[PDB]
Design a protein around this nucleic acid. Sequence first.
RNA 1: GGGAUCGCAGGAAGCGAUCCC
RNA 2: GGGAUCGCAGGAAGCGAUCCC
Lengths: 59, 59
Amino acid sequence: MLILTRKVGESINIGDDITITILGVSGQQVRIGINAPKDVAVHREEIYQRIQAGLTAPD
Amino acid sequence: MLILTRKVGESINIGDDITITILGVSGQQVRIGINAPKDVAVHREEIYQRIQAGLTAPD
RNA sequence: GGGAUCGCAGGAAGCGAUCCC
RNA sequence: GGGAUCGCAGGAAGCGAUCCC
C-alpha cells in the first residue's frame, strides 16, 4: 500500500494517464473523482466484479 | 471526470493492476491508500509535478 | 476506542500536533 | 445558507433521502 493525505478540492496521480480528485465529503461518506482515458476501466467494487467475471479485456 | 462515492473503509478499482481505499478522514482532510505494482507510479500532485518537469524518470 | 481539526511526507492501511466524549 | 448522516449511481467536479440550526 502507498498512502497520501489531502484536503477536499485537491488531487493525486497514477501512471502517466490517470489523475484522482477528492471533490469533498458528506459526513463520513467521501466524494471522489477520476480522470483517465476510456483506454482504462474505473469503477466501484460493485461494478468491478462484473468486469472480472470473464471479460477484463473487452471486444 | 468519472465520479464515485464511498465511506471510510470502502474501496475503488482502476484498470487490472490498481485498487484504491479511503482509509478514513482527519477533519476536512482525507487519507487514502493505493495498491499498485512498482510497474506504475503514484504520487500526490506536489511530488508528481517534479516528475513531469522534464524527465519522468528518477536519478 | 471513536469523532472533530491542523500540519509533515511515501510503495507504509505512513508520521506529528490541537479539540471533544 | 451551513453542519451532521445515509442511499443510488457513471466517463459527469453526478443524483436522491434523513436529521439539526
